[PDB]
Amino acid sequence: GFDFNIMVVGQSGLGKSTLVNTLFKSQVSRKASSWNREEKIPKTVEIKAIGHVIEEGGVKMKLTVIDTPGFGDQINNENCWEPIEKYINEQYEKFLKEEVNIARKKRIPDTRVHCCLYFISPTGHSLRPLDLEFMKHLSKVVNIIPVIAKADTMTLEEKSEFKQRVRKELEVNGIEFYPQKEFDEDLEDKTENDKIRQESMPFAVVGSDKEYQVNGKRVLGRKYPWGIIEVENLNHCEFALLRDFVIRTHLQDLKEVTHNIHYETYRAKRLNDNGGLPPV
Amino acid sequence: FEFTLMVVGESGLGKSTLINSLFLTDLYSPEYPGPSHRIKKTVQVEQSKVLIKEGGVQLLLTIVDTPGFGDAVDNSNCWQPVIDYIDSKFEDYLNAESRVNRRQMPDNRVQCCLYFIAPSGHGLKPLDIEFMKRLHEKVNIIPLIAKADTLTPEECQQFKKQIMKEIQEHKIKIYEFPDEEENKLVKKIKDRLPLAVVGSNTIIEVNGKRVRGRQYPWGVAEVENGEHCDFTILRNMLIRTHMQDLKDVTNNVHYENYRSRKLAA
Ligand SMILES: Nc1nc2c(ncn2[C@@H]2O[C@H](COP(=O)(O)OP(=O)(O)O)[C@@H](O)[C@H]2O)c(=O)[nH]1
Ligand SMILES: Nc1nc2c(ncn2[C@@H]2O[C@H](COP(=O)(O)OP(=O)(O)O)[C@@H](O)[C@H]2O)c(=O)[nH]1
C-alpha cells in the first residue's frame, strides 16, 4: 500500500467535506456522527486531519484528509493563509528528519500534502481577493487543484462563463496550479494536461451523500422539487472529471511533483539555514 | 408616493437579480450596473432613484446599495459606511424639523434594508451577526436566504431553524409584521423566516405555461412558485401590502430613537 494526503481549503459551507466523501465513496470526512457535522466556526484558522485505510484489491491506500476550519470565515481574514503554509512547511520538516530512515522501514511515513483542493464559491463574477491571495502564496509550495464549489447553483451558460473567467484570472496572475505545465514528461503528457488546464479546470464539482432512483437507475445526486442532479453525470457537473483525475490517473504524479519539486526546494533551502551545512 | 430600499450583502448573491425581479424593471443595466460592478478601494454607499408604474400606480423607488460589503479579506468596520448613510439621513430629517420655515419636509430615511445571507446550509457567518446586531435599531432589516435553489428542501428547512435560533440568541430584532386577513399573512410569514428567495429575469416554457425561473439540465427552479422559494411572499409583503407600515416604523421607532439619543448630549 501507499500513503496519500489531501487538503481541502475554502469558506465554511462550500460542500468540502461532502465532496471528499464523494471522491472516495466513503465516510472519510472528519465530520461523521450526528451533531459533529454541525460544527462551530473557530475564531482562528485551525488545521485538522483524519486517517482512513481504503482497500481496493491489494491497494491499501492510507488516506489522510486535512481540512482547514476557519478559513475565510472571520470578519478579518488577513493573513489567514499563513497558518496553512506553516502546516505544509512543517510536514516537509517531518519528512526531512525521517528520510534518513534509522528505523529501516521499507516505506518512510509520508504526511506531506500531495494535493490541495481550493473551493471557489460560484459568484458569477470575478475571483475574490481571498481566492487570489491564497493561491499565489500556496501554489508555490503545494499542488493546488481549483474547483468550483456547488456547481448545481449555475446554469450551463453561467458555468461556462465562470470557468473561462477563473481560468483567465489564474493564468494572468501567474498562478501555476497543478498540473503545472513545466512538469509535463513528454508530448503525451502535454496533450492530456492541456485539455485539463484549458477545459476541464476548474472542476465544477457537485457532492452528494444520498442516492435516488432516476428513471430506473440508482444514482448519486441532490433532490430538488424541480429535479435531481446526478453527481456522476457529465451533462450535469464535472465531478467525474475530478475523480478520474485525482484518483484514477494522476494520483502518483501528484506525489512525485510534491517530492521532487516542492519538498526538494524546501530541503535545499533548509540545508543553507542555521549557519549552513555541518562540517564533514 | 416614495420608498427607499437598501440591499446589503456579498457580491454574487443575486442582489441585482432579485431587485430587478421584484420591480419587473431594469433598475440595474449596462448603464447603471449592479453593486458588484461599482466596487472601489473602500466600502461605498450609492443610491439610484427611479420611477416605477406598479399596476397603473406610480412609485418613486430609491435603491441604496453597498458595493464592496463583505468582499474583502479584511471586512473590519465594513458596516460603518452603512451606519453613516442611515444616520446622516436621520440628521437630515432632524435638521428639517428644527427649521423655522419647515413647510416642506424632505424624507430620505432608509425605510427598509434587505440583508442577503449566503446559503451555507449551516448558520450565520460572523459578518452577518455583526451587521444585523449593529443596524437593527437603525433600519428595518429583512433577512433573506439568497439563492434558495442552492439548498434542497430539507437543507433549507433546518438552515432557517438555525438562523432564527441565532437571531433569537444574539437578541437580534428583525422587522416584524403587526383586519384578520392582514393577520393571515402574518402567520404564514412567521413560519417561513428567514425567507428563502430565488431571482431571475428569464422566462421559459414549463409544460405550456411560461414561468419565470432558472433552467438547469435536471429541472427548472420557478421564481413565482411558493413551493420552490419564498419570492412571492417577499414581493407581496414589500410592495403591495406592508410598504406603508415599513415607512411608519422608520419614522416612529428608529428616527425617534436616533433623535432621543442625539439630543440627550
Ligand atoms: N447546492 C449544493 N449544496 C451542497 C453540495 N454539496 C454539499 N452541499 C450542502 O452544503 C451544506 C454544507 O456542506 P458541507 O459538506 O458541510 O461542506 P463544508 O462545510 O464546506 O465542509 C450541506 O448542507 C450540504 O447538503 C453541492 O454540490 N451543491
Ligand atoms: N442559483 C442562483 N443563481 C442566481 C440567483 N440570482 C442570480 N444568480 C446568478 O448569480 C450571478 C450573479 O448574480 P448578481 O445579481 O449579479 O449578484 P449580486 O448583484 O452581486 O448580488 C448571475 O450570473 C446569476 O445568474 C439565484 O436566485 N439562484
Side-chain angles (χ1 to χ4, degrees), chain A residues 11-19 31 37 149-153 205-208 222 224, chain B residues 120-122 149-151 155 158:
Chain A
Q11 297 173 352
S12 177
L14 286 181
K16 291 170 309 213
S17 62
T18 295
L19 187 77
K31 322 174 184 160
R37 312 177 184 276
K150 303 190 190 294
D152 42 338
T153 79
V205 303
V206 171
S208 177
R222 297 171 49 77
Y224 292 104
Chain B
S120 314
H122 288 287
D149 43 347
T150 299
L151 314 132
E155 299 162 357
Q158 75 176 7

Side-chain angles (χ1 to χ4, degrees), chain A residues 122-125 152-154 158 161, chain B residues 10-18 34-37 146-150 197-200 214 216:
Chain A
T123 58
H125 297 280
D152 42 338
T153 79
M154 300 175 299
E158 299 169 8
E161 175 188 4
Chain B
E10 294 185 313
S11 291
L13 291 182
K15 307 183 308 298
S16 294
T17 313
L18 188 69
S36 311
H37 306 262
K147 303 196 287 195
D149 43 347
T150 299
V197 305
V198 178
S200 177
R214 296 176 44 77
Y216 302 106

